[PDB]
Amino acid sequence: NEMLKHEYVKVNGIKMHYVTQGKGKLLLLLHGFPDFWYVWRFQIPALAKHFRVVAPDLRGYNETDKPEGVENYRLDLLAKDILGLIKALGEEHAVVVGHDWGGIISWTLTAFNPQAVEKLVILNAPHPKAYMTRTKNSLRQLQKSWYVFFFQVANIPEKILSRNEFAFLKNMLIQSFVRRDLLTEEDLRIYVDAWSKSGALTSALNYYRANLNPDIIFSEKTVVFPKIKVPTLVIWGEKDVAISKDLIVNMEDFIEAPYSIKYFPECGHWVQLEEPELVRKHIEEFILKSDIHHHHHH
Amino acid sequence: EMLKHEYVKVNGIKMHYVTQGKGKLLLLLHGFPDFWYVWRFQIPALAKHFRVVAPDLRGYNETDKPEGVENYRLDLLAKDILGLIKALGEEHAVVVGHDWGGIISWTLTAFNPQAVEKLVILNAPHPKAYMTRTKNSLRQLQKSWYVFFFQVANIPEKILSRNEFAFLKNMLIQSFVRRDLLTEEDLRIYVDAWSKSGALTSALNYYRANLNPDIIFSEKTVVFPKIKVPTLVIWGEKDVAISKDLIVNMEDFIEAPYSIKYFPECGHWVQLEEPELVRKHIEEFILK
Ligand SMILES: Oc1ccccc1Cl
Ligand SMILES: Oc1ccccc1Cl
Ligand SMILES: [Cl-]
Ligand SMILES: [Cl-]
Numbered sequence: 136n137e138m139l140k141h142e143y144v145k146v147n148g149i150k151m152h153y154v155t156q157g158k159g160k161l162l163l164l165l166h167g168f169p170d171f172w173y174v175w176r177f178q179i180p181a182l183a184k185h186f187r188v189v190a191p192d193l194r195g196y197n198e199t200d201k202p203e204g205v206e207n208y209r210l211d212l213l214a215k216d217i218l219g220l221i222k223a224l225g226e227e228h229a230v231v232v233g234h235d236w237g238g239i240i241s242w243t244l245t246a247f248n249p250q251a252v253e254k255l256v257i258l259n260a261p262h263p264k265a266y267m268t269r270t271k272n273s274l275r276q277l278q279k280s281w282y283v284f285f286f287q288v289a290n291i292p293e294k295i296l297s298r299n300e301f302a303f304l305k306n307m308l309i310q311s312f313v314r315r316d317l318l319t320e321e322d323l324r325i326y327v328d329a330w331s332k333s334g335a336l337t338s339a340l341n342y343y344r345a346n347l348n349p350d351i352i353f354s355e356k357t358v359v360f361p362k363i364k365v366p367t368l369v370i371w372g373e374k375d376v377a378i379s380k381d382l383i384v385n386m387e388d389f390i391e392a393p394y395s396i397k398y399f400p401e402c403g404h405w406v407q408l409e410e411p412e413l414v415r416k417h418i419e420e421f422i423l424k425s426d427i428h429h430h431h432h433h
Numbered sequence: 434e435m436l437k438h439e440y441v442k443v444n445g446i447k448m449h450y451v452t453q454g455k456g457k458l459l460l461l462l463h464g465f466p467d468f469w470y471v472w473r474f475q476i477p478a479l480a481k482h483f484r485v486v487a488p489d490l491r492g493y494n495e496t497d498k499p500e501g502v503e504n505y506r507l508d509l510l511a512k513d514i515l516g517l518i519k520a521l522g523e524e525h526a527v528v529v530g531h532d533w534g535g536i537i538s539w540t541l542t543a544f545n546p547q548a549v550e551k552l553v554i555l556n557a558p559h560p561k562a563y564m565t566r567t568k569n570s571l572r573q574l575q576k577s578w579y580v581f582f583f584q585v586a587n588i589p590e591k592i593l594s595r596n597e598f599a600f601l602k603n604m605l606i607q608s609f610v611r612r613d614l615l616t617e618e619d620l621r622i623y624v625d626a627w628s629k630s631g632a633l634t635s636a637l638n639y640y641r642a643n644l645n646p647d648i649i650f651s652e653k654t655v656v657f658p659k660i661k662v663p664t665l666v667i668w669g670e671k672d673v674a675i676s677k678d679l680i681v682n683m684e685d686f687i688e689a690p691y692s693i694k695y696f697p698e699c700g701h702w703v704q705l706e707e708p709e710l711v712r713k714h715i716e717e718f719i720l721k
Contacts, residue, residue: 280578281577287584295650299652349585350592
């Protein structure tokens with residue numbers, strides 16, 4: 136049957152790497168910082184039983200192209216990469232699942248391009264308008280976002296994050312997990328391989344510099360963000376060291392469509408690694424649910 | 434004898450201070466985003482018994498404000514205070530420091546024990562505890578979000594000062610344990626000091642010079658002599674800016690009588706929240 140394959144495609148001016156397995160509805164899985172496609176290792180084979188799973192490396196990461204310059208990492212361009220990818224895969228629509236930055240991009244792609252997104256899944260990613268509105272008024276979110284401010288400085292964060300074989304990034308991950316020994320030494324080797332790709336760390340930090348700089352966080356302008364019009368599932372690990380529960384209060388207000396949120400009270404930011412089977416189960420059930428209900432109790 | 438203003442040349446700069454009282458010299462040193470006025474509740478009461486001197490530190494209020502991040506390095510700040518003691522015609526002082534004033538007081542004391550009779554610290558980490566422990570404390574890194582914010586040029590000054598310092602006012606107000614601790618009058622006086630030409634950038638330069646990420650995440654050992662003079666630490670436990678991680682286990686840092694008084698219901702601005710009890714503890718420590 137279908138085994139995992141690596142592939143490469145031109146999208147929106149760049150060459151993007153992805154892995155894919157399975158046949159059927161296109162299901163994109165989009166990672167965040169400081170991950171790459173491999174973050175989805177527990178979900179790919181299980182979802183490939185039902186779906187055509189595609190897990191790309193985003194702009195800047197791992198095997199994907201890394202344009203120079205902060206302006207090349209603005210949210211608008213990242214979402215246009217994903218629209219480009221759906222087309223380059225020979226499709227018009229996708230179910231889109233996004234974690235962390237992958238989720239911020241997914242919220243954005245869905246709001247501005249609802250025609251490309253059949254259903255939306257978000258894991259532990261604040262709605263961008265909630266972040267931009269609420270952060271400056273939330274001491275707990277400002278505290279949790281200490282590293283967003285750190286990342287704004289040029290040159291020096293890349294140096295600090297990469298010293299002693301990326302000890303800093305390893306520690307960021309390790310201190311974020313609810314369970315000990317979640318990553319093996321072997322997993323850490325694989326992550327260092329990706330982090331070490333020339334230009335990867337600078338490009339990753341450029342997402343923060345382009346979209347979460349202090350002028351934006353403390354802006355007096357309100358952000359324009361259309362309501363979400365496609366069925367949405369949010370999966371949320373509650374012990375998230377990066378996102379305050381302040382930012383998810385009344386999240387459903389952003390959605391004018393069927394909306395479900397599944398809380399995982401004992402899991403953290405990396406919910407897909409902490410309860411990988413229950414995450415997979417919830418995503419599958421959501422996608423396979425019929426949108427037409429004309430045979431109650433048959 | 435009432436509170437009087439003075440100005441004195443020290444270490445290349447002119448420093449403004451207020452003073453009241455006669456006898457043993459007692460220095461009160463403010464931190465960010467304060468000035469001498471933060472000591473308003475303690476100065477008259479302590480002046481009954483001591484020669485109280487409360488300066489504006491380098492960069493602040495009516496004190497000189499040299500240009501350039503390098504001019505705010507800790508060694509220069511402590512040398513300003515050594516210079517002040519001498520300019521006041523003394524050879525030593527009792528030194529009380531809050532926040533940056535406390536970081537400076539730890540530094541002055543460690544390197545110049547001859548200039549310090551006794552040391553009082555209010556809600557200020559030992560600089561070497563900060564430099565050693567912060568990188569290993571998620572709670573301290575989180576509480577220091579604003580230290581990272583302040584590293585970037587120009588933009589923090591803009592944000593902090595917009596809408597008549599609404600941002601800075603909010604930083605203070607969110608830090609206090611009680612509502613309406615500052616009167617409208619107090620806020621006018623704070624705004625007046627924040628508005629002094631160059632004050633805000635010079636204040637932020639302390640963080641850029643001393644708490645930049647190269648320092649915080651350095652793996653080098655910091656060389657800091659043990660404190661050799663009697664020390665009292667006063668600590669408001671509801672401090673939004675400092676984790677209890679940084680103040681425990683001072684034994685390695687202090688080779689002299691040391692005591693710590695915890696204020697479980699007070700925050701970072703302990704001298705404003707419990708002004709009488711703070712003053713009482715200071716007075717008893719110096720006299721007894
Ligand atoms: O580090 C990213 C962006 C800041 C919000 C937390 C995650 Cl999604
Ligand atoms: O804002 C200052 C310096 C960083 C530690 C907290 C206070 Cl003393
Ligand atoms: Cl392959
Ligand atoms: Cl759970």
